[PDB]
């Protein structure tokens, strides 16, 4: 996260760290959506142009963390993966269209003060909240600039109008994406960056006071560049694929 701040303890209890077994390193963020399912970005697991192709046994999920590097004894839970599911039509070849993956944990995780699932939006929530100008929140242990934080970072960013998203890049934008960030005129900054991928873009419902995940940190060109924006996987748009995977497996 660039131009963010240290998160508060328990501020983002659905935040998951994707951790590589060997070498031991941070792979990506992710989010907890039930006691057994973790949501992340496909490019975190599979991206052939960089020879990236992780399997269940390459990874650990670490839930309930604050410190990036510390083993948070008695606080974090570490879990193994039973099964990874990548969206069938994930377009890694072109534009990271449908950049979404689900991960089933070997065993259910126990909820605590530090560990708690975020909600998935229904159609009404999405319609109501996904609007230009409305702000969401991104969290992660990623790079601080285009150098690494000791603690989970947080930043709040506005959803940007679609035409402005399109006109900022040469990449072909789809309905399965939205972009977020400040315009260069707005005089505030902030962006996700490397290491933040697969993390949650969340919004708090003013109707029922619940946090909902609207987006997944997906891609950008550099980090926090003027006139460039962060792109997020549009979660509600892919919800039928999510529901399908979950009640089928």
């Amino acid at each position: 996260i660039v131009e963010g701040s240290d998160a508060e303890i328990g501020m983002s209890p659905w935040q998951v760290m994707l951790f590589r077994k060997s070498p031991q390193e941070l792979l990506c963020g992710a989010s907890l959506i039930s006691d057994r399912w973790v949501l992340t970005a496909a490019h975190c697991l599979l991206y052939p142009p960089w020879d990236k192709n992780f399997t269940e046994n390459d990874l650990l999920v670490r839930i309930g963390k604050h410190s990036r590097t510390r083993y948070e004894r008695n606080i974090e839970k570490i879990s193994m993966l039973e099964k990874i599911y990548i969206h069938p039509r994930y377009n890694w070849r072109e534009n990271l269209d449908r950049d979404i993956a689900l991960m089933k944990l070997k065993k259910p995780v126990a909820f605590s003060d530090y560990i708690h699932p975020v909600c998935l939006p229904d159609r009404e929530t999405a319609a109501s909240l996904l609007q230009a100008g409305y702000k969401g929140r991104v969290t992660g242990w990623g790079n601080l600039k285009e150098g690494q934080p000791s603690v989970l970072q947080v930043v709040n960013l506005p959803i940007v109008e679609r035409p402005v998203c399109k006109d900022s890049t040469r990449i072909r934008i789809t309905d399965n994406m939205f972009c977020a960030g400040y315009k260069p005129d707005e005089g505030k900054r902030g962006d996700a960056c490397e290491g933040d991928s697969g993390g949650p873009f969340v919004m708090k419902s003013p109707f029922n006071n619940r946090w909902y995940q609207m987006g997944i940190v997906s891609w950008g060109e550099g980090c926090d560049r003027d006139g460039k924006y962060g792109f997020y996987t549009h979660v509600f748009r892919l919800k039928k694929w999510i529901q399908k995977v979950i009640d089928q497996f």
């Binding site: 530090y114 699932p117 975020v118 506005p158 708090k204 006071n209 619940r210 946090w211 909902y212």
Partner: peptide, 26 residues
């Protein structure tokens, strides 16, 4: 179920430091 309600915040009726910025934008 109990989704999106944080034990250390909503469940205690405590607000985090920048939460207000989001709601003001809606």
């Amino acid at each position: 179920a109990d989704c999106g309600l944080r034990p250390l915040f909503e469940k205690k009726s405590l607000e985090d430091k920048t939460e207000r910025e989001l709601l003001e934008s809606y």
